[PDB]
């Protein structure tokens, strides 16, 4: 099928392409954020939110992928092979999981509408040529 | 983070491993079942149900896994090494995805509670001696 | 001290004396059944029922017996006598444990009264010669004989 | 499963680890006490209490372990072996069984809460260095 994991949440894979690949934090950083803020809800027996559901599934997907790649490397012989293997992973699958984790953790921390408006505004900012681009990029905050 | 993908629905990996691995259908068959029965709701922009959410996420996960496995198989030279990697991915991740897709499809089809009762009943059945159990294996049916 | 582990639950050993050994699932099968159906309640800090209590005690007993028998088979110094050791175990203690675990898991799934009636009827059946009894034993199941769930 | 036989009775294997292993009486003594005090209730057709249930099960388990170890010592030839076997038994399985029997008998006799508090206090006593450790170890008593 051709499923978009975001249009169920009011976005698309092309609205999140407004943000470059350089923008998304590491999976370690995002998993730490989750474990810090929504651990007792992700480990809960409740349908607390579609965002929680999707975050659980994404974490399990990252687990499966890491396990596969690690077993591959451990069973593979050459080191450079392993190196560009994990490079391809971090480039293709890690990026998608980063986008997903960011989207969901931000929709939990700030709000779905807030995050979508942030995406629009950051697209404005990053389309704006640098000569006319302010330095104070848009950012998500519960503060002034 | 010690996440169970089934306890927000009322199940557990212990309750799904309570059935033989040789019971869950092929992931191809399950994906076809989904494409036939709920494609219009999985490709929809609606929180139709947590089952739909998890099903979308699981389909995407399987897609990513297959992409990676195909990539590493193409990279590898030996069909022996390819057999190794495909057998591993099947045995572990394909089995997990089989369990997940079966759970969610069967739930959307028959009922979460019917599926859980079916799990326990089929487990007790397959663990019971044949001379002291009903001879026909249990099965789910929408037909009276 | 002349204790019957079932007299408290309304049964006896003379009532389960009729059930054959081929009737009870393996100990691993029964332990898995318990882990899947009542693990949350057996690992709980509550008195859920005497059946839960006795199930916990029986699982602990089986663990102790397993440790003992494995240590023995290991330190025996002849891989030929471990066969007879495990034979004795699976013939006496494994059988008692299967009996007990089955009784409790069943009195939890179905009712205590249901299980006792099943035992009475199964005794009627197994005491009857094959030439005069029906060929298919009575059945205790959460399913109809057709086994189709809707 | 990770069943704790005392969690439903308000204790744990960490609370009874305070008491040493040389503290618990012999299974003979414990069974004599159990008979004398609660025979007509353990031989009874009643869920008189979960303590009674667990005590019955423990007595049966001990009888079973003894049957097994007896059969093993018989079919074994070397007396050194046989003594090593029964020593292993007395050190692991007999120890756990008499922990359980002590817990449940003492509970039936004095109160589950009395016994929990006794465990805590005995921990205090056994952790107290000997220069300040009273010789009068804590003891369960009604009068």
Author numbering:
A (entry chain D), B (entry chain C): 1 to 144
C (entry chain B): 1 to 150
D (entry chain A): 1 to 143
Question: What does the paper behind this entry write?
Answer:
The inner shell is an icosahedral capsid formed by 240 copies of hepatitis B core protein (HBc). Peptides based on the hexapeptide “LLGRMK” block the interaction between capsids and L-HBs and inhibit virion formation. These peptides bind to the tips of the spikes where envelope and capsid are in touch but are distant from the hydrophobic pocket.
Therefore, we determined structures for WT-HBc, F97L-HBc, P5T-HBc and L60V-HBc with bound peptides. The splaying was transmitted throughout the protruding part of the spike tilting the ascending helix α3 and the descending helix α4 outwards. The length of this density could accommodate 5–6 amino acids, which is only a fraction of the P1 and P2 peptides.
